[PDB]
Amino acid sequence: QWALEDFEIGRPLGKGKFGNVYLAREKQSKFILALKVLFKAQLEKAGVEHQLRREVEIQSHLRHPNILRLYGYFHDATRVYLILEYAPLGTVYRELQKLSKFDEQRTATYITELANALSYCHSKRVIHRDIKPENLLLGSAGELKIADFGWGTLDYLPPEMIEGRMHDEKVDLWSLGVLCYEFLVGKPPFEANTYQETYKRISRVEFTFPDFVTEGARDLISRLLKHNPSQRPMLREVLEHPWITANSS
Ligand SMILES: Cc1cn2c(-c3cnn(CC(=O)Nc4cc[nH+]cc4F)c3)c[nH+]c2c(Nc2cc(C[N@@H+]3CCC[C@@H](C)C3)ns2)n1
């Protein structure tokens, strides 16, 4: 249905592992959006193709306020184009580089917004499995918006995923705890200088808190960062946690 001709391309917003995402404007409507321009080569040469058709069919039917909407797609001779919602306030990754760390109030609200989005996702049996600051964006109101559902650093992946074992929706609960720690501390709990140092830290669940981390934050992260998935809470408990209710908005 769509074609490059129907849009006016703007500045590059960011370069990713398969191509770049540009600011764009559909000519007739004047609708501002994000144009993820990915190379057919870089994608197909790494056997990724199947995940992009997934991202297409998942992100398009996925309608929620905290989920980057996908309006459509197309593919010319050399490249592949996904027409996406534009997050005026950019990535959470960039915000965290600017601020270094986020306060208890900004963290709680992001976990809440992630939790509500993931709660909606776990209904259609949609598990993200790849939540990380780079895939978390910010709408006009500074509200969190998740991108890239088609699915590499180990940081946010739980033991089950890395060890090649059976995984559930509980994978995203763990990622929420790696994020909650990261947003408050400024680095993820298992951050190491090698894949193998990280693989060991995640496997043995070896992480520490700086002095400033609140007891309620120490609690939630510790509840979420459990090796056995069953022992992790579920989203309705995260949303009802005393640290989240006290500090969220
Ligand atoms: C980078 C980027 C991406 N955007 C998306 C988007 C769409 N898809 N995805 C996922 C994806 O591209 N993934 C991906 C790409 C390639 N290969 C593998 C992959 F997995 C993110 C939507 N909106 C944006 C966006 N908006 C911005 C606003 C401002 C405005 N800014 C605010 C702060 C202060 C100042 C600088 C002004 N800056 S950036 N930025």
Ligands in the model, by name, code or SMILES, are: the ligand Cc1cn2c(-c3cnn(CC(=O)Nc4cc[nH+]cc4F)c3)c[nH+]c2c(Nc2cc(C[N@@H+]3CCC[C@@H](C)C3)ns2)n1
Question: Which geometry do the CA atoms define?
Answer: globular
C-alpha-based Rg, rounded = 18 Å
CATH-scheme architecture of the largest domain: Orthogonal Bundle
Name the helicity range.
25-40%
- One letter per element, helices H and strands E, the order comes to EEEHHEEHHEEHHHHHH
**Secondary structure category:** alpha+beta
Write down the CATH class of the largest domain.
Answer: Mainly Alpha
- Main pleated-sheet profile: 5 strands, antiparallel
Strand arrangement within the widest β-sheet reads 1-2-3-5-4
For the termini, the CA-CA separation is 40 Å
Question: How many strands in all?
Answer: 7
Domain tally: 2
User: What is the number of helices?
Assistant: 10
Give an account of the 3D structure:
With 249 residues, the chain is an alpha+beta fold. The protein has two domains: 2-90, Phosphorylase Kinase, domain 1; 91-248, Transferase(Phosphotransferase) domain 1 (Transferase(Phosphotransferase), domain 1, Orthogonal Bundle). It has ten helices and seven strands. It has helices at residues 40-44, 49-59, 92-99, 104-121, 159-162, 170-185, 195-203, 215-224, 235-239, 242-247; strands spanning 7-15, 19-26, 32-39, 70-75, 79-84, 136-138, 144-146. Strands 1-2-3-5-4 form a five-stranded antiparallel β-sheet. The protein has a two-stranded antiparallel ribbon with strand order 6-7. Helix 4 runs antiparallel to helix 6 (170-185). The protein is globular, with a radius of gyration of 18 Å. The N and C termini lie far apart (40 Å). The PDB classes it as transferase/transferase inhibitor. Keywords: inhibitor, transferase, TRANSFERASE-TRANSFERASE INHIBITOR complex. It forms a monomeric assembly. The entry is titled "Synthesis and SAR Studies of imidazo-[1,2-a]-pyrazine Aurora kinase inhibitors with improved off target kinase selectivity". The protein: Aurora kinase A. The organism is Homo sapiens.
